[PDB]
Amino acid sequence: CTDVSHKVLRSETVLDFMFNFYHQTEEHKFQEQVSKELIGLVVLTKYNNKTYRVDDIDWDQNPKSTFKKADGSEVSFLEYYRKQYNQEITDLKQPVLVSQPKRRRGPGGTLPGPAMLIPELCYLTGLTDKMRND
RNA sequence: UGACA
C-alpha cells in the first residue's frame, strides 16, 4: 500500500512500470509523477540492451511512430525494433521516452544518452547517469 | 561537435 519508487529492478520495461503507475495516481497527476520517476533517470533498450537517460517521457507518440529508412523505407518503432532486433513491442499504445542529455549548458560537459525509446522495452534502471564533466 | 533516434 502507498508504495513507490523501485531500487533498480532486474527486468521490466518502463511501460510495465508507468503501467502500475497508471493504476494509481489520477490523470493529470499521473503523467506529472510518472515522468518525475523516469525523468533524470535512465532506461534499458531491450532490443539493443542500451541504456539512455530519460529526461522526458513523450506522452504523445506511441510505439507505432514511423520514419523513413536509408532509401526512405517508412518503418515504425514497432517495426524498426521488431524487424531489426525482434523485441516485440506488443503494448503498441503507450507513450515514448525522450531521452535527452539536457546538459547544464554550464562550461562544456555535454551530457550523453539521447534516444527515442519504447516504454515497452526500457528495462527500468537507476543509472541516472550524470557523466558530463561540467 | 547531440554514437543503433
Curated annotation (Swiss-Prot):
<comment type="function">
    <text>Endoribonuclease that plays a central role in postnatal germ cells by repressing transposable elements and preventing their mobilization, which is essential for the germline integrity. Acts via the piRNA metabolic process, which mediates the repression of transposable elements during meiosis by forming complexes composed of piRNAs and Piwi proteins and governs the methylation and subsequent repression of transposons.</text>
</comment>
<feature type="region of interest" description="Required for binding 2'-O-methylated 3'-end of piRNAs">
    <location>
        <begin position="51"/>
        <end position="53"/>
    </location>
</feature>
<feature type="domain" description="PAZ">
    <location>
        <begin position="13"/>
        <end position="126"/>
    </location>
</feature>
<feature type="site" description="Required for binding 2'-O-methylated 3'-end of piRNAs">
    <location>
        <position position="116"/>
    </location>
</feature>
<protein>
    <recommendedName>
        <fullName>Piwi-like protein 1</fullName>
    </recommendedName>
</protein>
<comment type="similarity">
    <text>Belongs to the argonaute family. Piwi subfamily.</text>
</comment>
<comment type="subunit">
    <text>Interacts (via Piwi domain) with DICER1, suggesting that it forms ribonucleoprotein RISC complexes; this interaction is regulated by HSP90AB1 activity. Interacts with MAEL, KIF17, PABPC1, PRMT5 and WDR77. Interacts (when methylated on arginine residues) with TDRD1, TDRKH/TDRD2, RNF17/TDRD4, TDRD6, TDRD7 and TDRD9. Interacts with CLOCK. Interacts with MOV10L1. Interacts with ANAPC10; interaction oly takes place following piRNA-binding. Interacts with RNF8; leading to sequester RNF8 in the cytoplasm. Interacts with TEX19.</text>
</comment>
<feature type="modified residue" description="Omega-N-methylarginine; by PRMT5">
    <location>
        <position position="105"/>
    </location>
</feature>
